[PDB]
Amino acid sequence: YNYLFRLFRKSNLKPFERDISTEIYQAGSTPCNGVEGFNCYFPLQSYGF
Amino acid sequence: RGWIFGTTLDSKTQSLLIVNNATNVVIKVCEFQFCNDPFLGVNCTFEYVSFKNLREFVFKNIDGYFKIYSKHTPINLVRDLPQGFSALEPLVDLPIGINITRFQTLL
Numbered sequence: 001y002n003y004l005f006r007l008f009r010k011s012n013l014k015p016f017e018r019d020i021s022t023e024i025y026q027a028g029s030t031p032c033n034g035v036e037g038f039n040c041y042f043p044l045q046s047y048g049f
Numbered sequence: 050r051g052w053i054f055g056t057t058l059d060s061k062t063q064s065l066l067i068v069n070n071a072t073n074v075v076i077k078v079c080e081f082q083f084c085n086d087p088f089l090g091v092n093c094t095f096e097y098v099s100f101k102n103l104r105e106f107v108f109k110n111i112d113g114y115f116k117i118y119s120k121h122t123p124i125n126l127v128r129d130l131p132q133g134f135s136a137l138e139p140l141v142d143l144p145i146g147i148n149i150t151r152f153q154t155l156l
């Protein structure tokens with residue numbers, strides 16, 4: 001679980017753009033207020049190889 | 050004596066700091082929590098080290114590179130920008146990969 005990838009973003013990256021940010025992704029009508037929930041996600045998955 | 054560049058300028062996203070030390074120029078990119086009103090007087094993805102005057106600078110961000118051009122010239126008169134022409138020459142081409150939407154100057 002040491003390896004991760006971003007599953008969601010506000011918009012696609014520009015060429016060689018690097019984005020660390022772990023602020024909560026809002027996927028819909030739920031106002032997330034800085035925490036996970038229904039349609040609110042921590043934007044990084046792990047591969048679990 | 051320098052500049053801040055970024056999107057949030059709060060630590061929620063990375064930002065670029067450029068500072069002149071008179072001994073050196075110091076450049077650093079980090080998740081900085083910058084001051085509410087920064088000042089000078091007597092993690093981190095990248096780091097680098099190296100009226101009478103007019104100093105001119107051009108800044109642009111392209112394909113993750115941050116490009117700087119500059120020129121220094123004397124001036125004869127002090128009211129505002131002197132009418133005329135001279136071209137700025139490339140200073141540095143930093144491979145930083147950060148997004149920029151806002152900036153501020155360090156007085």
Ligand SMILES: *[C@@H]1O[C@H](CO)[C@@H](O)[C@H](O)[C@H]1NC(C)=O
Pocket residue numbers: 010011012013014017056148149150
């Ligand atoms: C760069 O940051 C701005 C900050 O407002 C944001 O709107 C934009 O989506 C970002 N650019 C890319 C290519 O994601």
